[PDB]
Design a protein around this ligand. Structure first.
Ligand SMILES: [Mg+2]
Ligand SMILES: [Mg+2]
Ligand SMILES: [Mg+2]
Ligand SMILES: [Mg+2]
Ligand SMILES: [Mg+2]
Ligand SMILES: [Mg+2]
Ligand SMILES: [Mg+2]
Ligand SMILES: [Mg+2]
Ligand SMILES: [Mg+2]
Ligand SMILES: [Mg+2]
Ligand SMILES: [Mg+2]
Ligand SMILES: [Mg+2]
Ligand SMILES: [Mg+2]
Ligand SMILES: [Mg+2]
Ligand SMILES: [Mg+2]
Ligand SMILES: [Mg+2]
Ligand SMILES: [Mg+2]
Ligand SMILES: [Mg+2]
Ligand SMILES: [Mg+2]
Ligand SMILES: [Mg+2]
Ligand SMILES: [Mg+2]
Ligand SMILES: [Mg+2]
Ligand SMILES: [Mg+2]
Ligand SMILES: [Mg+2]
Ligand SMILES: [Mg+2]
Ligand SMILES: [Mg+2]
Ligand SMILES: [Mg+2]
Ligand SMILES: [Mg+2]
Ligand SMILES: [Mg+2]
Ligand SMILES: [Mg+2]
Ligand SMILES: [Mg+2]
Ligand SMILES: [Mg+2]
Ligand SMILES: [Mg+2]
Ligand SMILES: [Mg+2]
Ligand SMILES: [Mg+2]
Ligand SMILES: [Mg+2]
Ligand SMILES: [Mg+2]
Ligand SMILES: [Mg+2]
Ligand SMILES: [Mg+2]
Ligand SMILES: [Mg+2]
Ligand SMILES: [Mg+2]
Ligand SMILES: [Mg+2]
Ligand SMILES: [Mg+2]
Ligand SMILES: [Mg+2]
Ligand SMILES: [Mg+2]
Ligand SMILES: [Mg+2]
Ligand SMILES: [Mg+2]
Ligand SMILES: [Mg+2]
Ligand SMILES: [Mg+2]
Ligand SMILES: [Mg+2]
Ligand SMILES: [Mg+2]
Ligand SMILES: [Mg+2]
Ligand SMILES: [Mg+2]
Ligand SMILES: [Mg+2]
Ligand SMILES: [Mg+2]
Ligand SMILES: [Mg+2]
Ligand SMILES: [Mg+2]
Ligand SMILES: [Mg+2]
Ligand SMILES: [Mg+2]
Ligand SMILES: [Mg+2]
Ligand SMILES: [Mg+2]
Ligand SMILES: [Mg+2]
Ligand SMILES: [Mg+2]
Ligand SMILES: [Mg+2]
Ligand SMILES: [Mg+2]
Ligand SMILES: [Mg+2]
Ligand SMILES: [Mg+2]
Ligand SMILES: [Mg+2]
Ligand SMILES: [Mg+2]
Ligand SMILES: [Mg+2]
Ligand SMILES: [Mg+2]
Ligand SMILES: [Mg+2]
Ligand SMILES: [Mg+2]
Ligand SMILES: [Mg+2]
Ligand SMILES: [Mg+2]
Ligand SMILES: [Mg+2]
Ligand SMILES: [Mg+2]
Ligand SMILES: [Mg+2]
Ligand SMILES: [Mg+2]
Ligand SMILES: [Mg+2]
Ligand SMILES: [Mg+2]
Ligand SMILES: [Mg+2]
Ligand SMILES: [Mg+2]
Ligand SMILES: [Mg+2]
Ligand SMILES: [Mg+2]
Ligand SMILES: [Mg+2]
Lengths: 129, 142, 150
RNA sequence: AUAAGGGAAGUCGGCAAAAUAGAUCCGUAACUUCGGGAAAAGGAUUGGCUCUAAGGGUUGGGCACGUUGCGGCGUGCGGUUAACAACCAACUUAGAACUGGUACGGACAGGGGGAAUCUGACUGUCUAAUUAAAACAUAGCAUU
RNA sequence: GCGGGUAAACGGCGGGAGUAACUAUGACUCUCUUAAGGUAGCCAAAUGCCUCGUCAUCUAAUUAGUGACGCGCAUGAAUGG
RNA sequence: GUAUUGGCCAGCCGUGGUGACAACGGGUAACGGAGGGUUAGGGCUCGACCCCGGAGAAGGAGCCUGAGAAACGGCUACUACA
RNA sequence: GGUAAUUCCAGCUCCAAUAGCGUAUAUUAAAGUUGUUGAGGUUAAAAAGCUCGUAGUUGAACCUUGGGCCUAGCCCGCCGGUACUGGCUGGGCUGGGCCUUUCCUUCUGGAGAACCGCAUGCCGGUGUGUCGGGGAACCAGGACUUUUACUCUGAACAAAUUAGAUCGCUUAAAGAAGGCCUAUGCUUGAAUACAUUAGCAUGGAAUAAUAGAAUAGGACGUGUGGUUCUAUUUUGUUGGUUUCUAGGACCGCCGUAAUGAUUAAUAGGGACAGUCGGGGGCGUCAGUAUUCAAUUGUCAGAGGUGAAAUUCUUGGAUUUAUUGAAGACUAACAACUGCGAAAGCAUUCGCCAAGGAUGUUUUCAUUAAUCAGGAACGAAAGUUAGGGGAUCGAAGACGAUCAGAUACCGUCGUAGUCUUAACCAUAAACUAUGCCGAUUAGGGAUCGGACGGCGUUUAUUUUUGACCCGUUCGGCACCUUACGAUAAAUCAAAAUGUUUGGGCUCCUGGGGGAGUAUGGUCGCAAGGCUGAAACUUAAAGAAAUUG
RNA sequence: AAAGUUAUCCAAACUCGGUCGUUUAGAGGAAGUAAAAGUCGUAACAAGGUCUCCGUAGGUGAACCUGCGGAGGGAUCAUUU
């Protein structure tokens, strides 16, 4: 059964982009999904997205503009200290100059670079580059 | 594929690795301690014994020669084994009742080369060392 | 797909987006409640109380007209059944299989069905006990189950 | 009927005799048709006297009216004695102290046991007056 | 009389020669022969003459006892194994 | 009874305690730890041995003196050696 | 290495490390050959025969967001001046205040400010004072606050060791020393970080769980009544008694309020409607054929094979027509078609309970996914008791073939083949491919349900049914293609995997010994499930290419 | 106030029996691996000359043969009213 709505959204986005399409549809919509898209949007990796409102859960239609290589999710949301955050960027990021690792903390979800500025840590939920 | 992946499944993963670890052959012989029990040497590197007789052993099929081994009974536990005397014309240095010292071929319990059923070689005889006698660096005591 | 099967059908009902009664209904919520209680006293369970209202005259959704579900209305009027109807129908089917089975001793297929039905009853009864609908000591005894149905 | 030391060296052969034995508490193998084997094998305790504890039966229960020779009923009720009080009656079980020439199922009564082979499955029956058995019978199975 | 059936009916169920890189043994082959040539099992057994058979065990010493071996004078399948 | 608590022990009365989240039992060529060796990260393996804690003085038990010992370069007895 | 040895035994020459170098055993890297990061399971080692279900692991969405002002601290850009200094209505980063329906619990006490006026003094500000309207903030004390995990910062915690700062022991491994003019003197160092699980405090409030008002046994009030317990100092002192007051527990009456219930998942269960199928059980009906038997006609061969023989026959075989009995089996229609959890299921009709898909503006509201042990069913052969016993036919007996033929071929034939009541639990039980969910490409056929449409056919005829065109949900399959995958054969999954994480169970680690020995457990037995070690070996094996 | 003495408690040590673990002798029986210029056949790989294999049952000097139900890893992806 559906055990991770976030994985379904990120997987569906990756498939359409890899095939060269321009738009995607996501069947279930949640707060974590929208907060994940907003982080990607502010860095220019996607465009506008719109949330149609059926009374059950709503859908999302995202607009693609290339520039996106992969967007994945880590299924067991591990606990990561602030001191060991550099282990992860060495693992699942192509290079040190660019790329973002998404965390969830008590101060909202944010990428791995803003968390360093605010000096906050938490749980890891995904990545995109 | 097919592993448990949840955040509270540390018990299943630890138990599974312990069970499947026995299929390894190197680890299985370490855990059961077969060397301490079955090996003629008590898990040691060398051993001393007494020579009983001189035996010639035929080489395997592609080759053709006589390997000129020797029979020895271990002092430590009374077991009987056969050992190979290396180099050319070295049986003339091992008489009867000579207190030889042995070692392995380095294949860790398997026969080396074309010699069948031989796992040890003579290192010293009468406490002089075989190779030193071969190059005439010493004279065998009487 | 299915609880005990391999089918994967998707047949269901689609609820309209609108949450307001149509302009041609012209029936008060109070009249609907009195209509519900008459049918419940005649013996109907909530299942076909709704379908009678929908097919015969008027109401398509009881919730939109009155703001409450059918079972909730009946409970406040002291008309709720002693055991839930969904569990009641499962018990009724299990009794009929046992009665047929004892006459046909070597019907090996019907024996398989009885294990599935009873296994479905135990799962459903556990949920009702942990929510408070049924007393914690309630047990499905095959011997005395025939009295509950009728 | 009893015998020092030895304990089957006797004899066709342990034939005759000896040893074991009641009750309470521990303990119990191979094999097996799972019912048995089993009282397997092998150990401990036992008197007298002075005490302690447990196991039962019967009759009694508060006011308010009415009848009647201190009360038996008519009733009208209420209460459940945080189970008390008097009286009556046989035996069976467990525990402690003291005591003796260490003895005590003190006479009577009262299983020797274990490892294996041959043979008939078992209980049962027969040569009265030399043979009780491996012989006969038996359930089960098969044929006319 | 001629011709069929029937063994949980009465009963029956074999000899001689050669042959494997030492010796021994004989899976294999030729040969005589009829109703069929003893199969599964078991054994010096209450059934074995030669016999106190040969090997092991039990004893200081055992024609006895038990466990094995089997060309078995003359074991053997409801004459039941 | 002990320096004191305690089923540590003696009487009387209840029927409990542990277990698939691995009890109970068997193996250990097992004293525990700080730590040694080998390394991308994650690990695998060893630790009698100079520092800290525990135990023993051939094998078992008992005790004297003393603030402190069930002591062995203290005593008594049995077993084994001499 | 078998007569010209680049490999043995020797002399020359040369190579590697060097005061050191070789051998044996243990252990780590190499090993992504133990795989949480990170490993195979269609054919190379390996998905339980199949379904139900408890521990265990894992579980859909939803509750205060946004906006509008003010202010600080750190960088960068720019300008100008001498690393210094100032400026930009500089653009950013981190943080703190206010108004938007929200902002921040409460009482006692301490000390005391800002803002205020009073008069007393200098050149419209100020010490003024035991001045008072007044307490920003702060400290101490009391009461109230759903509960865990997680992360941040603190506290507490060993020396040596590991990382690491300082100082030329002549350098170094070390050491904790030393330095300055010359001094009858001065001066310094012996830092810092890490552990990390558990326990004690602090800030944050996302993510994952948890608690609350539904038979109101609910919240609030200086509203208003009750009955119970406790009693500080004030009336001299002690004792006794009473009122008021203060506090606690509990129960009414009245009032106040927007008075208290999230969706209805292309998650799941249940109800209802018209259907569909060789799904299961009991009973019953029919069909020709095979074998036997009775009646009937005729006359010499019939059978069987590559070719023959054994066998049957004028005691009339084989062949021909009519009739009867018995047991087994359901031809053709029958297919890249249907149903069932799998094993499996095909003649008619009656009875009995069950199931999938489709249709639906019915109902419940997370009731779900997968499962160690445990349980139901499980072809054929085989086992125990009765019935039945046509046909085929293990064992067995003969005829040929052959050098031999205990076989292939031919004539006979027992158990068995069928049924009722009980056991057995294994198959190449196969798609050699576990189950749930999401996404990814074109095409035409077909089975079941619904919806739309022009006609033809046809009936006591319309609506329905048969045929034709199109859409859609659910199934058994197939054709093309490769952006993708694989060692390859090939695959719409065997794809979305070095750019590696959606959830869950089982199994495998070079070839033999070996699914064997032994112990345990189930079975009447045959046997099933569980399952080693000694020893031995450098290759077994998979897909494809040329001969 | 010493020797001695009465009754409990803590108890080494020895004797007999039970039970568990490790090591080891044994007539005879039945397997595996290797080494061979051995004897008898030819089961498998080509339609291996009877297509091969799987579960089960019986039989034979030996490989193997035969019955019943499966599978293609086959020697057929295929035959029309
Ligand atoms: Mg290995
Ligand atoms: Mg679905
Ligand atoms: Mg399920
Ligand atoms: Mg299912
Ligand atoms: Mg005497
Ligand atoms: Mg005497
Ligand atoms: Mg005696
Ligand atoms: Mg005698
Ligand atoms: Mg006699
Ligand atoms: Mg006698
Ligand atoms: Mg007597
Ligand atoms: Mg008994
Ligand atoms: Mg007894
Ligand atoms: Mg006795
Ligand atoms: Mg006995
Ligand atoms: Mg007494
Ligand atoms: Mg006695
Ligand atoms: Mg006596
Ligand atoms: Mg008898
Ligand atoms: Mg007589
Ligand atoms: Mg007599
Ligand atoms: Mg010969
Ligand atoms: Mg014989
Ligand atoms: Mg004999
Ligand atoms: Mg004899
Ligand atoms: Mg005899
Ligand atoms: Mg016998
Ligand atoms: Mg004799
Ligand atoms: Mg004898
Ligand atoms: Mg004798
Ligand atoms: Mg004998
Ligand atoms: Mg005879
Ligand atoms: Mg006979
Ligand atoms: Mg006889
Ligand atoms: Mg319990
Ligand atoms: Mg250790
Ligand atoms: Mg030790
Ligand atoms: Mg140590
Ligand atoms: Mg040691
Ligand atoms: Mg050392
Ligand atoms: Mg010593
Ligand atoms: Mg002192
Ligand atoms: Mg000590
Ligand atoms: Mg001592
Ligand atoms: Mg000393
Ligand atoms: Mg000392
Ligand atoms: Mg020469
Ligand atoms: Mg030469
Ligand atoms: Mg030369
Ligand atoms: Mg691998
Ligand atoms: Mg395989
Ligand atoms: Mg399968
Ligand atoms: Mg959730
Ligand atoms: Mg240094
Ligand atoms: Mg905290
Ligand atoms: Mg729904
Ligand atoms: Mg049917
Ligand atoms: Mg016939
Ligand atoms: Mg005729
Ligand atoms: Mg018939
Ligand atoms: Mg069909
Ligand atoms: Mg038909
Ligand atoms: Mg299981
Ligand atoms: Mg069957
Ligand atoms: Mg059968
Ligand atoms: Mg019978
Ligand atoms: Mg029968
Ligand atoms: Mg036939
Ligand atoms: Mg035959
Ligand atoms: Mg199998
Ligand atoms: Mg399989
Ligand atoms: Mg398609
Ligand atoms: Mg078409
Ligand atoms: Mg259709
Ligand atoms: Mg239509
Ligand atoms: Mg379709
Ligand atoms: Mg289908
Ligand atoms: Mg890597
Ligand atoms: Mg076994
Ligand atoms: Mg080679
Ligand atoms: Mg090949
Ligand atoms: Mg032995
Ligand atoms: Mg032997
Ligand atoms: Mg063949
Ligand atoms: Mg073939
Ligand atoms: Mg092939």
């Amino acid at each position: 059964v559906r055990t991770s709505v976030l994985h379904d959204a990120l997987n569906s986005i990756n498939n359409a982009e890899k095939m060269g399409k321009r738009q995607v549809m996501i069947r279930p919509s949640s707060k974590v999904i929208v907060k994940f898209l907003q982080v990607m949007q502010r860095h220019g990796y996607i465009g506008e997205f719109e949330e149609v409102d059926n009374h059950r859960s709503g859908k999302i239609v995202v607009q693609l503009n290339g520039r996106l290589n992969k967007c994945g999710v880590i299924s067991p949301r591990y606990n990561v200290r602030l001191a060991e955050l550099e282990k992860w960027v060495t693992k699942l990021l192509p290079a040190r100059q660019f790329g973002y690792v998404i965390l969830t903390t008590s101060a909202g979800i944010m990428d791995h670079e803003e968390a360093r500025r605010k000096h906050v840590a938490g749980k890891i939920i995904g990545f995109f580059y | 594929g097919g592993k448990p992946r949840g955040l509270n499944a540390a018990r299943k993963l630890r138990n599974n690795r312990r069970e499947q670890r026995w299929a390894d052959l190197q680890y299985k012989k370490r855990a059961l301690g077969t060397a301490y029990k079955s090996s003629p040497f008590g898990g040691s590197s060398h051993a001393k014994g007494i020579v009983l007789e001189k035996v010639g052993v035929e080489a395997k099929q592609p080759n053709s020669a006589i390997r000129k081994c020797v029979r020895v009974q271990l002092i430590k536990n009374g077991k009987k084994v056969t050992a190979f005397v290396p180099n050319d014309g070295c049986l003339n240095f091992v008489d009867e009742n000579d207190e030889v010292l042995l070692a392995g071929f380095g294949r860790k319990g398997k026969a080396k080369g074309d010699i069948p059923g031989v796992r040890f070689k003579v290192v010293k005889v009468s406490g002089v060392g075989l190779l030193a006698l071969w190059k005439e660096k010493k004279e065998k005591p009487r | 797909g299915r609880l005990h099967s391999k089918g994967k059908g998707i047949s269901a009902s689609a609820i309209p987006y609108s949450r307001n009664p149509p302009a041609w209904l012209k029936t008060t919520p109070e009249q609907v409640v009195e209509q519900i209680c008459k049918l419940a006293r005649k013996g109907a369970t909530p299942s076909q109380i709704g379908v009678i209202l929908r097919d015969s005259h008027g109401i398509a959704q009881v919730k939109v007209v009155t703001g409450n579900k059918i079972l909730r209305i009946l409970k406040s009027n002291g008309l709720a059944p002693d055991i839930p109807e969904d569990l009641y129908f499962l018990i009724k089917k299990a009794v009929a299989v046992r009665k047929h089975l004892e006459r046909n001793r070597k019907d090996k297929d019907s024996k398989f069905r009885l294990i599935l039905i009873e296994s479905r009853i135990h799962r459903l009864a556990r949920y009702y006990k942990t929510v408070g609908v049924l007393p914690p000591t309630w047990k499905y005894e095959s011997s005395t189950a025939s009295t509950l149905v009728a």
